[PDB]
Structure formats: structure tokens, C-alpha cells
């Protein structure tokens, strides 16, 4: 149980570091909208190729 | 008290000394490193409150999946026919859903 | 009489373990809330120092 | 009686001294060893009543 | 009575070996998840340094 | 009693000291030698009950 608490707190620190990295992009509109436009236009291009096929 | 006059003259001396030194480029480079150190320490404090948010959210997920495993244990007790184990599994669900609601209230 | 006492002690232990483990997990949670409150106090104190230096 | 005022001031002094000391991590580590010592002694008492049952 | 105890001890050993070996393999797995989380923290920290230097 | 506050601060000091030390590799190597020493002593106890059976 004691060594499992040390493993648990280490993985909780990874989840807090992951949340802090996600917050560095939260409300950062330029990178956030760039990633959204890249994903949206990639799906629309794949569907345009599927409609052409 | 007597120390007061020594305070006035040392305050005048250090103001003369700094005033003789001060320049636009030095205050600009100091002001950007000051705001960088303030910003990185304050973002580390936000990373601690985010870590407590994700800690309490993963605790809520662990209790809510454990509560469904006590419903699985209650179903298994009912197919075994063991009423005392089915009733204990209901009491486990009732208490563990109360701790889940406590974690959900803290997370809110 | 010893087995009815033995079950009564088992109930006393089960209730005690439940309330101790609840109190300890809630104490860890409120200490994490107090750590977040301390971080907000540091944020306001450094914002005051940014104010006077600016 | 006269001892009463000496009791009030020593109670205030020891409260100031402990208050100056107290921190979240120290009370958490104390609280887990306190419950471990209570639990192991109480389980030994249950082992005595189980031994009388058997 | 000794052979029924001997089988009962064999069951206790088999259950103990199963839960120990499960706990040790799960501890290695969660340490590998924590190593991946540390690598994502280094990635975000170096991306911050790429940001300020750029 | 007065010893209580000295217990809280020494418990906080030893928790700070161990927390500063702790790492994933050290706890993994300790956990495998801990289970090896537990397993070999418990198998020696089983060898004593087997010797009484034979």
C-alpha cells in the first residue's frame, strides 16, 4: 500500500503537468483556432476525395 | 527617537545613489525579467490548482466505477441467492455514491 | 453470547474503519483546498509587487 | 486559588508555542500513524475475544 | 487435521502469490505511465523555451 | 501532554526528508526484495508444517 501511494502521487503529478500544458493552450485563440481549422479542413478534404471517388 | 534622523539621511543617500545610476534600457530589461519570473511562478500556482482539480475528478471517476462494480457484486449475490451479500453491496453503493457526491461537490 | 458479542465488535470495527477512512480522505481534500488558497494568496502578493515595481 | 492565574498564562504560552509550530504535512503524517496504532491495538483486542470464542 | 491445514496453507500461499504478482506488475505499468507523463512535461517545458527564444 | 507537539514536528520533518528522497526505481527494487524475503520466510514456515505432516 505504501509503495502504491508513491506510484499514485507520481501519476497525479503527471496529470497536473498534463492539465497545466492543456491550460497553456486554453484561451490561446491563435493556436487553438489553427488546430481546429487544420482538423476541419483535413476532414472536408477527405470527404471531397470520397465524393470524387 | 534618535534613529529617525539617521533614517532620513540614509534614505536621502540611497535615493541620490540610485538616481545617479538609473537609465531607460536597464529598467526595460529588468521589467521584462520581472514579469517573466512573476508569470512563470503564477502559472506554476495555477498548475497546482489544476492538479487538485484533476485529482478530485479522477477520485470521482474511481468511486463511480467502483459503485458500478458493487452493482455487479449485488447482481452476483442475487444469482448466488445470498441476501446478506446483496444488502451489503447495496450499503457499499449508498456510502460510495455519497463519497462520489462529496468529490463532485469539491470538483464543482 | 460470545458469538453475538463477536459480531457486535465486528460492527463496531466496521463503523470505526468507515468513519476514520472518511475523515482522513476529507482531511487530505481540505488540505489540497488550503494549498490552492495559499497559491491564490501568493498570486495576489506577487501582483502587488508587480504593481509597485511597474 | 492563586495557582489558577499561573494555569491561564502557561495554557496561553503552550498554545502560542504549538500554534507557531503547526503545519499540514506534520498533522497528516501524525494522523495516519495515530490511526495505525489505534487499529493494530484494537485488532489485537478483537484477537483476544476471538481466542476466547475458539 | 494436519493435511487439511496443509492444503489451507497452500491456498493462503496461492492467493498471496497471485495478489503480490498482480500488485508488482501493476506498479511497473503505472511507473511506465508516470514516465510517459514526465516526458509530456519535458515536451511542454521545452516548447515554452522554444516560445521565449523564438 | 507536552511531548505531543514535538511528535507532530518530528513527524513533519521525517515526512519532508523522505518525500525529498523518494523515486520510482528505488521503490521498485525495494518492493521486489521485500516480497522475496517475505516469500522465502513464509515457504520456510510451510516447510516446518510439512515436516510435522511427514
Residue numbers in the entry:
A (entry chain 0): 164 to 216
B (entry chain 0): 2 to 109
C (entry chain 0), E (entry chain 0): 110 to 163
D (entry chain 0), F (entry chain 0): 2 to 55
What does the paper say about this structure?
A prominent member of the PspA family is the vesicle-inducing protein in plastids 1 (Vipp1), also known as IM30 (inner membrane-associated protein of 30 kDa). Vipp1 appears to have two functions: in membrane maintenance (that is, during heat or light stress) and in thylakoid membrane (TM) biogenesis and/or remodeling.
Using single-particle-based helical reconstruction, we resolved the structures of type I tubes at 5.1-Å resolution and two structures of type II tubes at 7.0-Å and 7.1-Å resolution. The type I and II tubes differ in their diameter and the arrangement of the monomers relative to the tube axis, as well as the diameter and thickness of the engulfed lipid bilayer tube. In contrast to the Vipp1 rings, the monomer orientation of the α1−α3 hairpin with respect to the tube axis is the same over the whole length of the tubes. Nevertheless, the monomer orientation among the tubes differs; in type I tubes, the α1−α3 hairpins are oriented parallel to the tube axis, while, in type II tubes, the hairpins are tilted approximately 45° relative to the tube axis. Remarkably, from rings over type II tubes to type I tubes, the α1−α3 hairpins accommodate a wide range of orientations along the tubulated membrane axis from perpendicular to parallel (from 90° to 0°) while essentially maintaining the same intermolecular contacts to stabilize the assembly. The here-determined structures of Vipp1 polymers in the presence of membranes indicated that helix α0 is immersed in the outer lipid leaflet of the bilayer. However, in contrast to SynPspA helix α0 that protrudes toward the bilayer, Vipp1 α0 lies flat in the membrane plane and appears to be partially submerged into the outer bilayer leaflet. The bilayer thickness in all three Vipp1 tubes remained nearly identical at 35 Å, although the inner leaflet radius changed with the tube diameter.
